[PDB]
């Protein structure tokens, strides 16, 4: 709680003031320490105000309570060589709050206690009540060694710490002073769009996947999606010589993000760039319950998997806004339908609808957002509760017989996922009773996940002038048994692979299957050549397609990727592809 700050002489010791722990921040007044280190056995100054005479150690200003202008307070005066004495008084207004009590030298920084009973200010400097009006921050002195070539930094400050909104702009501002060629990577377009506003005044340029490269020759920062970067690498004839790459929300495990990390890592290793991965949950994360800006109530209890008729009154009785993470769109459809039956206003989020739907979570009003894992990647909600059954679907490449991709599960999420889901709330210092309602244990092992080998399909097909095959980022290499370069395509097969993903909008595995079979982009025969069991279903109907040349054919692909038909947007897109319009 309250600590005496002593100064060591040659053989003596004297009190020079008073400070307050919380934790994990030690608070005192500037003139007491002058920014020097203190130790109970070291505490380093991380935030200071010289004009108002305040300083804090170990983090930002924790004590945000203030005097209500009316009531009594207690100065917990810690006088040197004297016992701690509580003295009650009534402060007055002069605008500055001040006490009329006088204590002798060495008592400066003594806590003035609320009724009852947080600290509302510090005694010292009528005698003024000195109190900060700020939240954090603490202060981000940008370490210049993060800009050295062949250096990769993982910026892993907890969720809400301010990586995106506070540290990233600072770094970009600093990198622009150093005249570095900077690339910023955002997980989704809407998130990038948010970043665009927070980087106001700066020369940032948003880059779309419809353009393969875009060089201005001006001092300019490129902003783009993880996936846009990867797509440009597969298609552009220009090497992008950025010497600083910042990937934000670097926990994203979609194949394009994984491949991007590997390429950025290869670029660091070659010596051509510095790299920064921003995520509280880097590869290998085990902790599902990380630090938050505000206290979280972690509530464990049964959560419905589908529509419910009774026994979950706690879901709908709750009086704030809820973010509910579902394993799939279909599971989301069931949950959303059930909530709307009770007259609840729900917004549904998925990868393909994120761009249109997520903006609405800001400029409309709602009770529930029902989302897939996509909301783990920097999606901000002004909500008080997360419902997290800690469940997801996992794409898996089956080799038992003919090669296909299935969505396995629902299965438990990684610890990293659970943390990012939980991490949606507790982010607001002014709101202290956010809830994380969850069910089940998370699961580390996801070696059978299709995204890692798909990442290698992307990687194996990016060529560098140095002749080096880009490989998975270090911590991620164990997640596939795939051999470096085994997925490398060349000539027309390579070009068709890229095109099937870029314009065809097909998954990586499927695009690779079709292209390496020697099929041209515009040839769609394979969408109808599949066996009996490959018949695609939609809303309980066998899908039939009206082809390019006017034939009515059953949708029955040679290669079966569950992702083209498990996602209703992907099915609609795939039907257009099979038809030859795409």
């Amino acid at each position: 709680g309250v600590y005496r700050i002593m100064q060591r002489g040659l053989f003596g010791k004297t009190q020079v003031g008073v400070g307050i722990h919380m934790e994990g921040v030690f608070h005192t007044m500037w003139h007491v320490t002058r920014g020097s280190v203190i130790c109970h056995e070291r505490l380093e100054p991380s935030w200071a105000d010289v004009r108002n005479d305040m300083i804090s150690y170990g983090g930002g200003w924790r004590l945000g309570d203030k005097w209500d202008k009316e009531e009594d307070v207690q100065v917990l005066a810690i006088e040197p060589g004297k016992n701690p004495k509580h003295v009650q008084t009534k402060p007055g207004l002069f605008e500055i709050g001040a006490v009329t009590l006088d204590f002798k030298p060495g008592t400066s920084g003594s806590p003035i206690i609320n009724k009852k009973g947080k600290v509302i200010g510090l005694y010292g400097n009528v005698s003024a009540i000195t109190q900060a009006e700020r939240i954090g921050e603490p202060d981000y002195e940008v370490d210049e060694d993060i800009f050295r070539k062949k250096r990769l930094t993982i910026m892993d400050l907890h969720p809400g710490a301010g990586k995106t909104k506070r540290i990233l702009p600072s770094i970009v501002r600093e990198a622009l002073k150093r005249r570095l060629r900077t690339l910023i990577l955002a997980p989704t377009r809407v998130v990038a769009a948010e970043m665009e506003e927070a980087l106001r005044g700066l020369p940032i340029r948003y880059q779309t996947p419809a353009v393969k490269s875009d060089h201005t020759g001006r001092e300019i920062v490129d902003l783009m999606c993880h996936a846009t970067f990867t797509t440009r690498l597969l298609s552009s004839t220009r090497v992008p010589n950025y010497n600083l790459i910042v990937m934000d929300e670097a926990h994203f495990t979609d194949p394009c993000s994984v491949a991007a990390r590997g390429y950025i890592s290869t670029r660091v290793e070659m010596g051509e760039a510095a790299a920064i991965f921003m995520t509280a949950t880097p590869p290998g994360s085990t902790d599902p319950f990380p630090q938050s800006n505000s206290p979280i109530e972690d509530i464990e209890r049964e959560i419905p998997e589908r529509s419910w008729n009774t026994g979950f009154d706690w879901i709908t009785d709750y009086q704030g806004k809820t973010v509910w993470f579902v394993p799939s769109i279909k599971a989301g459809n069931d949950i959303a339908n059930c909530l709307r039956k009770s007259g609840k206003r729900v917004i549904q989020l998925s990868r393909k609808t994120f761009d249109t739907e997520y903006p609405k979570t800001k400029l409309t009003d709602w009770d529930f957002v029902v989302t897939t894992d996509i909301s783990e990647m920097g999606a901000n909600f002004r909500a008080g509760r997360v419902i997290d059954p800690r469940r997801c679907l996992k794409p898996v490449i089956l080799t038992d017989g003919p090669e296909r991709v299935i969505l396995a599960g629902p299965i438990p999420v990684t610890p990293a996922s659970a943390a990012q889901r939980r991490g949606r709330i507790g982010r607001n210092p002014a709101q202290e009773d956010d809830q994380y309602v969850f069910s089940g244990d998370p699961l580390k092992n996801d070696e059978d996940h299709a995204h890692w080998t798909e990442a290698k399909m992307l990687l194996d097909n990016i060529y560098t002038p140095e002749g080096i095959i880009p490989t998975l980022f270090g911590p991620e290499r164990e997640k596939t048994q795939a051999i470096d370069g085994e997925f490398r395509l060349r000539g027309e097969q390579r070009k068709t692979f890229v095109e099937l993903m870029r314009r065809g909008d097909l998954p990586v595995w499927l695009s690779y299957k079709v292209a390496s079979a020697g099929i041209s982009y515009k040839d769609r025969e394979w969408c109808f050549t599949g066996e009996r069991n490959n018949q695609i279903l939609e809303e309980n109907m066998e899908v039939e397609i009206w082809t390019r040349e006017g034939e009515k054919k059953k949708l029955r692909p040679k290669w079966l990727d569950a992702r083209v038909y498990a996602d209703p947007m992907a099915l609609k897109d795939f039907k257009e592809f099979a038809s030859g319009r795409k």
């Binding site: 005496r4 008073v18 307050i20 320490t33 917990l76 806590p111 206690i113 009973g117």
Partner: peptide
């Protein structure tokens, strides 16, 4: 002129 800390009391009323 090194700086160290010593406990005094806890943050409380009365």
């Amino acid at each position: 002129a090194d700086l160290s800390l010593e406990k005094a009391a806890n943050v409380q009323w009365d």
